[PDB]
Amino acid sequence: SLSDKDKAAVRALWSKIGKSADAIGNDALSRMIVVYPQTKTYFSHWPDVTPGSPHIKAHGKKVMGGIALAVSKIDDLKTGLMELSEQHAYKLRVDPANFKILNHCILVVISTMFPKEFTPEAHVSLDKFLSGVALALAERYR
Amino acid sequence: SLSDKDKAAVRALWSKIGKSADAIGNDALSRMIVVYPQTKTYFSHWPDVTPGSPHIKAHGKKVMGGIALAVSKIDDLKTGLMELSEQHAYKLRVDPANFKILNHCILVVISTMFPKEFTPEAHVSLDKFLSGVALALAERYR
Amino acid sequence: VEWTDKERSIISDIFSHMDYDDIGPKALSRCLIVYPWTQRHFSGFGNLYNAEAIIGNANVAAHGIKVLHGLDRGVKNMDNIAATYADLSTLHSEKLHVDPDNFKLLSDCITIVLAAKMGHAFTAETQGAFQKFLAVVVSALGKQYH
Amino acid sequence: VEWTDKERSIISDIFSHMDYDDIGPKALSRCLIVYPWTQRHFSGFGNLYNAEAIIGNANVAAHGIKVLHGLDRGVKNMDNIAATYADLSTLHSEKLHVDPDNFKLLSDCITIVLAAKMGHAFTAETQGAFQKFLAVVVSALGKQYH
Numbered sequence: 001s002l003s004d005k006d007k008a009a010v011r012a013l014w015s016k017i018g019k020s021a022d023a024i025g026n027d028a029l030s031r032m033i034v035v036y037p038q039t040k041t042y043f044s045h046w047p048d049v050t051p052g053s054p055h056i057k058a059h060g061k062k063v064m065g066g067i068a069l070a071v072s073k074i075d076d077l078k079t080g081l082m083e084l085s086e087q088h089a090y091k092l093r094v095d096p097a098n099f100k101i102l103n104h105c106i107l108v109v110i111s112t113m114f115p116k117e118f119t120p121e122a123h124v125s126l127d128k129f130l131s132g133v134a135l136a137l138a139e140r141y142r
Numbered sequence: 143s144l145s146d147k148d149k150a151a152v153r154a155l156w157s158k159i160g161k162s163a164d165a166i167g168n169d170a171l172s173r174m175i176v177v178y179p180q181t182k183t184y185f186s187h188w189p190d191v192t193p194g195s196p197h198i199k200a201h202g203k204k205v206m207g208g209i210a211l212a213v214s215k216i217d218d219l220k221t222g223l224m225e226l227s228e229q230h231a232y233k234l235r236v237d238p239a240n241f242k243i244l245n246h247c248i249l250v251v252i253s254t255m256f257p258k259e260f261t262p263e264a265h266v267s268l269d270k271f272l273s274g275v276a277l278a279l280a281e282r283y284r
Numbered sequence: 285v286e287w288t289d290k291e292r293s294i295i296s297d298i299f300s301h302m303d304y305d306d307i308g309p310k311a312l313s314r315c316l317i318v319y320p321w322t323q324r325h326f327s328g329f330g331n332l333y334n335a336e337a338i339i340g341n342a343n344v345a346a347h348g349i350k351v352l353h354g355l356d357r358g359v360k361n362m363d364n365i366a367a368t369y370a371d372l373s374t375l376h377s378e379k380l381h382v383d384p385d386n387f388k389l390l391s392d393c394i395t396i397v398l399a400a401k402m403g404h405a406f407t408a409e410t411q412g413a414f415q416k417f418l419a420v421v422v423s424a425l426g427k428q429y430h
Numbered sequence: 431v432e433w434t435d436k437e438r439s440i441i442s443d444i445f446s447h448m449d450y451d452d453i454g455p456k457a458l459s460r461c462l463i464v465y466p467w468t469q470r471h472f473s474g475f476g477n478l479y480n481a482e483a484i485i486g487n488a489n490v491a492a493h494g495i496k497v498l499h500g501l502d503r504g505v506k507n508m509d510n511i512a513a514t515y516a517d518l519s520t521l522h523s524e525k526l527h528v529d530p531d532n533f534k535l536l537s538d539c540i541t542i543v544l545a546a547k548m549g550h551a552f553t554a555e556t557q558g559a560f561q562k563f564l565a566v567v568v569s570a571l572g573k574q575y576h
């Protein structure tokens with residue numbers, strides 16, 4: 001679970017990097033689909049899923065808006081992300097094994113874009129937080 | 143997270159099988175050390191870690207007493223298992239990757255001993271519960 | 285894996301005594317209940333509305349029996365498992381879009397169903413050999429990097 | 431893995447440009463902070479009391495440099511990785527009692543530290559090749575069944 005120290009660390013990091021949320025999301029989804037090609041099928045209804053796609057860019061804004069929502073809802077991620085859980089489990093049928101994949105890709109992108117801010121201490125709390133986000137997104141699955 | 147349905151299911155299963163907790167624990171630890179030999183090192187201070195050991199049998203009582211504690215504390219596993227978390231993280235330094243291993247071995251043993259009671263619906267809630275136990279045991283690690 | 289003769293004997297003994305028509309349906313229905321997102325691959329099988337329906341579903345049963353017979357090719361040549369399952373791996377990934385994680389979840393359900401049938405004969409050494417065998421098949425199906 | 435020529439070129443390029451003395455210490459100290467149970471293997475290295483101490487610890491630095499040089503043998507013969515690391519795997523397991531999960535945690539820290547150094551040059555295709563290579567080494571070290 002997240003301690004007060006973890007919550008403060010995540011909020012301070014997000015304060016620093018959130019200006020670039022849309023770019024982070026575009027890059028993280030772009031990487032997930034290339035490096036973990038089992039994920040591409042969930043986006044295949046879009047007219048373009050190739051590198052540089054405007055559908056990936058648009059969706060990246062939404063994904064990191066989901067992460068911003070989670071930062072805002074960090075004191076109770078289950079309640080905060082319940083609607084997104086239902087969407088991924090029931091409407092979209094995304095296999096929940098994939099949440100940790102996108103979380104790793106978000107960590108890689110933040111490291112590429114904010115190497116100064118993304119210290120080991122920022123990383124431990126953000127990884128705990130993304131684990132909590134994955135668990136909350138898993139809420140409606142079983 | 144555990145729903146009211148999950149909590150009721152776990153309590154009803156435990157009501158049925160808890161009479162055999164000590165035997166379940168002996169068999170589950172015995173299997174973990176043989177099938178996942180990376181775990182044996184944590185018990186190697188005991189004079190006997192071989193199949194049939196009385197130290198394994200004694201420790202099995204304690205492990206499943208920890209599971210009984212978790213059943214009793216199912217509404218708030220983090221608070222209920224906090225002391226055991228600290229013991230595993232700080233005094234014993236057990237790598238937290240191993241909690242899911244022992245959890246699988248507990249499921250295998252309950253299936254061998256209570257095939258009638260351990261239905262698929264009992265298994266989904268018990269697996270959710272053991273995931274929650276592992277997360278609570280992970281509380282003091284980072 | 286460099287199989288020991290004992291491992292080969294244990295795997296041969298288990299599969300010789302296994303009733304595929306009993307174990308296969310129970311393993312897959314158990315997977316569809318414990319890890320219900322896997323139901324997505326079987327939307328065309330008829331009733332999957334609740335646990336009772338899934339356990340009774342004959343299309344699920346036929347498929348679970350298929351899975352177990354699918355393990356036979358591995359049992360018959362335990363030193364060529366990755367190559368033997370290359371085509372099945374391509375089918376489940378390129379045509380069926382099965383997540384590679386799902387193979388491990390079903391294998392654990394097969395182990396738990398076999399443990400229920402074998403009872404105390406499902407010894408730790410039996411479990412070790414059977415899980416090692418399934419792990420090698422799961423790695424071939426999931427196209428794991430090694 | 432059947433490596434493509436492009437994968438071989440990307441791995442060779444990355445390791446040719448890598449400053450092991452910078453990346454090695456950062457990867458291991460990052461692992462000891464993000465996954466701090468791994469500190470148990472380095473109790474004799476001196477100060478590991480807080481993040482500042484771990485990052486500055488010269489024994490941690492030397493060890494992280496060792497890890498990266500330990501990847502060189504894999505880079506030099508990418509088609510023989512499992513055999514090449516068999517002895518290192520035995521050392522970490524039978525003598526050091528390193529949990530096999532820990533290899534994957536450190537590899538993710540190496541990837542994240544390399545991503546910070548390379549920045550936008552750490553393209554998705556670069557990440558894919560580098561992670562595939564580390565996955566093959568991690569499987570050899572952890573003695574995964576395949």
Ligand code: HEM
Nearest residue numbers: 039042043062063065066067087092094098099102103133
């Ligand atoms: C950090 C984890 C994730 C977060 C925060 C997240 C967030 C979101 C958000 C905010 C939406 C938009 C919901 C709406 O339409 O109102 C969405 C849609 C979606 N997500 Fe995720 N998601 C995550 C993980 C994943 C993963 C791992 C996958 C698949 C591999 C996935 C697949 C999808 C798909 C297919 C859609 C619908 C796109 C469309 O509208 O066509 N998500 N997600």
Ligand code: HEM
Nearest residue numbers: 181184185204205207208209229234236240241244245275
């Ligand atoms: C379901 C997960 C687990 C539960 C409920 C659990 C429960 C317990 C309990 C109740 C104790 C006794 C604490 C005391 O001394 O008061 C204990 C001790 C211990 N546990 Fe666990 N444990 C679990 C997982 C593990 C795992 C996965 C390992 C190692 C692979 C482990 C290794 C140990 C060791 C080495 C001890 C100390 C034995 C001694 O006294 O010499 N535990 N555990």
Ligand code: HEM
Nearest residue numbers: 322325326350351354355376380382386387390391421425
């Ligand atoms: C031990 C793991 C498994 C083995 C050995 C296995 C084996 C098989 C075999 C032998 C077939 C028949 C091929 C054919 O019809 O030509 C098949 C088909 C199929 N399998 Fe699997 N399978 C495994 C796991 C899975 C999992 C985990 C899923 C779903 C999550 C799955 C979904 C399917 C589907 C949807 C079909 C198509 C058959 C139809 O719809 O008629 N399989 N599998």
Ligand code: HEM
Nearest residue numbers: 468471472496497500501522526528532533536537567571
């Ligand atoms: C990519 C993964 C890794 C590689 C390639 C690797 C490589 C190495 C090498 C080359 C050595 C030196 C062998 C010798 O001194 O003869 C070594 C030693 C050692 N490694 Fe690793 N290692 C890896 C991961 C780990 C992890 C994850 C841990 C701890 C959790 C670890 C703990 C140690 C320890 C404690 C030593 C002993 C050296 C000493 O105390 O002087 N290694 N490793």
Ligand SMILES: [C-]#N
Nearest residue numbers: 029059062063
């Ligand atoms: C969601 N992507």
Ligand SMILES: [C-]#N
Nearest residue numbers: 171201204205
């Ligand atoms: C604890 N065993």
Ligand SMILES: [C-]#N
Nearest residue numbers: 347348350351
């Ligand atoms: C495949 N069933």
Ligand SMILES: [C-]#N
Nearest residue numbers: 493494496497
């Ligand atoms: C190894 N360090």
